[PDB]
Amino acid sequence: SLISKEELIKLAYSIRPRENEYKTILTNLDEYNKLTTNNNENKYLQLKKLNESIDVFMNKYKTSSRNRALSNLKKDILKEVILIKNSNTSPVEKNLHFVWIGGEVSDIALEYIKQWADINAEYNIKLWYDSEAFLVNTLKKAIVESSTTEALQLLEEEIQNPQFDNMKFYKKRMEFIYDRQKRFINYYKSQINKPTVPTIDDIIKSHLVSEYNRDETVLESYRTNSLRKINSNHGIDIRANSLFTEQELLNIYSQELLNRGNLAAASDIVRLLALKNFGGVYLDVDMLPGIHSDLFKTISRPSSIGLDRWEMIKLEAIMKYKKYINNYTSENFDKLDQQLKDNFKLIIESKSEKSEIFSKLENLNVSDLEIKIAFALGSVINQALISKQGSYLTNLVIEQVKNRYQFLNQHLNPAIESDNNFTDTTKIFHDSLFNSATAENSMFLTKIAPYLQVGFMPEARSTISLSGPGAYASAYYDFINLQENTIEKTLKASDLIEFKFPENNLSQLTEQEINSLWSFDQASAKYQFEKYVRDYT
Numbered sequence: 001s002l003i004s005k006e007e008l009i010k011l012a013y014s015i016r017p018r019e020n021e022y023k024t025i026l027t028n029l030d031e032y033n034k035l036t037t038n039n040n041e042n043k044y045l046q047l048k049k050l051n052e053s054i055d056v057f058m059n060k061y062k063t064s065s066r067n068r069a070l071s072n073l074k075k076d077i078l079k080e081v082i083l084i085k086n087s088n089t090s091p092v093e094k095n096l097h098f099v100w101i102g103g104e105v106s107d108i109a110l111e112y113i114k115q116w117a118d119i120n121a122e123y124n125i126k127l128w129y130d131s132e133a134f135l136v137n138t139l140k141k142a143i144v145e146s147s148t149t150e151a152l153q154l155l156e157e158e159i160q161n162p163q164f165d166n167m168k169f170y171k172k173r174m175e176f177i178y179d180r181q182k183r184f185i186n187y188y189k190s191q192i193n194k195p196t197v198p199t200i201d202d203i204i205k206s207h208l209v210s211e212y213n214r215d216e217t218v219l220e221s222y223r224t225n226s227l228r229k230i231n232s233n234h235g236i237d238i239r240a241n242s243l244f245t246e247q248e249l250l251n252i253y254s255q256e257l258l259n260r261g262n263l264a265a266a267s268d269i270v271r272l273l274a275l276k277n278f279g280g281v282y283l284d285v286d287m288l289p290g291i292h293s294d295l296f297k298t299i300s301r302p303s304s305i306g307l308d309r310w311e312m313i314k315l316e317a318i319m320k321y322k323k324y325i326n327n328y329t330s331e332n333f334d335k336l337d338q339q340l341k342d343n344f345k346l347i348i349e350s351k352s353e354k355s356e357i358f359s360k361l362e363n364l365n366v367s368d369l370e371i372k373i374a375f376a377l378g379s380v381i382n383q384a385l386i387s388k389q390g391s392y393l394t395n396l397v398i399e400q401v402k403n404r405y406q407f408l409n410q411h412l413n414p415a416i417e418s419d420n421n422f423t424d425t426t427k428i429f430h431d432s433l434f435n436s437a438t439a440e441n442s443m444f445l446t447k448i449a450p451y452l453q454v455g456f457m458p459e460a461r462s463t464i465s466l467s468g469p470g471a472y473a474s475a476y477y478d479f480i481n482l483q484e485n486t487i488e489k490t491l492k493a494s495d496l497i498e499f500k501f502p503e504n505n506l507s508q509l510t511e512q513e514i515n516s517l518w519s520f521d522q523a524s525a526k527y528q529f530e531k532y533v534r535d536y537t
């Protein structure tokens with residue numbers, strides 16, 4: 001709660017008459033204080049209105065004796081936001097949302113998912129997929145593999161030279177990739193309006209048969225198998241539901257799914273809509289249930305192994321002696337002391353059910369203002385989220401994503417629509433983009449400039465600032481500071497303890513997580529390239 005209007009009057013009292021902008025503050029404060037309603041949103045909006053009115057005063061009367069008391073008010077307002085979001089608080093909808101789009105869901109992922117279902121029988125499992133787009137990953141691989149071969153043939157004389165700059169390969173390949181995506185897309189555009197009303201998979205299958213020497217029967221049985229496999233396993237179809245309720249988000253989803261072949265970005269969109277509409281918990285398929293706090297509370301962690309690695313080996317232990325998941329790595333566990341390896345066996349064998357090893361979600365109490373998110377390396381990471389349907393912050397994130405894409409597309413579209421190659425298209429995009437640079441948005445611009453090569457070239461990481469963690473971190477900034485449309489600033493893990501995915505409720509250091517956190521950096525690029533050259537021979 002905030003100081004009364006009367007208290008502010010006393011605190012900010014001065015020899016001067018009350019400025020008009022000061023009277024407004026007093027009114028906004030009083031009206032906040034007199035809020036009878038207990039809906040979190042309406043309190044928030046009034047707090048926001050008060051805060052804005054304070055900035056108006058302070059920016060106009062920069063030397064006012066009142067500024068100290070008003071600066072103190074603004075500090076109290078920051079705390080009031082946290083008090084509100086922590087006020088009314090009840091369990092999220094009992095939905096676990098996963099997403100596997102663009103191909104056949106792996107068995108490996110089904111196993112990880114199975115663990116959650118077993119432990120939380122009262123939770124509905126939603127495995128989102130796109131019934132029309134099972135061939136999207138197949139197409140992306142065809143394009144990349146074809147382009148790799150084209151680039152290696154072109155650069156055949158140079159690639160073996162150990163001093164070869166592998167970037168020359170990646171740039172060259174990107175040109176071939178761009179031309180092939182553009183060929184696909186233009187063909188898609190010619191088909192999609194016919195009275196036959198073809199699907200994405202119809203169009204991809206035909207293109208693959210025509211241009212990539214594929215067999216229709218093989219493609220078709222992969223498609224029908226992917227469909228039944230996913231329907232049999234909590235599968236829920238994006239196309240038959242109410243996820244996409246307006247054209248703008250659909251188009252963002254489609255440009256990622258169809259034009260770029262970026263399934264991670266597509267999934268970034270789907271997870272947010274699933275949360276907005278249904279509420280619940282979202283998880284990547286490499287996340288696992290949290291382990292009971294006191295399970296290995298009696299095993300001292302050696303100084304030689306890190307905090308993270310210790311969390312990994314805990315999972316590996318559970319897995320060597322319960323094999324809940326097939327072929328779970330034992331690398332880190334096999335070592336080193338033969339004592340703890342038995343203390344591990346002792347405690348794990350002393351349990352008989354899975355629910356004794358893993359903790360249940362039960363009620364996750366959140367308010368209708370918030371979204372909770374996992375952390376990694378000091379940043380938020382959207383591989384795990386909790387949110388009530390229609391939550392204020394989840395909408396803030398969606399708005400961030402929409403405005404970032406609106407900006408991206410404003411500059412990108414004219415370049416795409418032009419009939420140009422990769423290099424010329426890039427230039428038209430960059431020349432428009434960087435002419436919009438301000439102090440405020442410069443970094444963001446620099447981050448989205450390599451958008452077209454995301455997934456295909458090293459260090460192209462635009463997704464983060466578009467549909468990924470960067471959009472969430474700016475939305476968190478919006479929310480904490482009662483601002484809107486923040487792009488320059490992000491809030492970090494250390495800023496957001498009040499919004500953390502409760503640690504006890506999640507195990508992030510899983511085997512599939514780690515061998516998935518592969519990033520397209522230089523080092524990884526060097527290795528991929530060396531593999532490419534070794535196979536080519």
Ligand SMILES: [Mn+2]
Nearest residue numbers: 286513516517
């Ligand atoms: Mn991962």
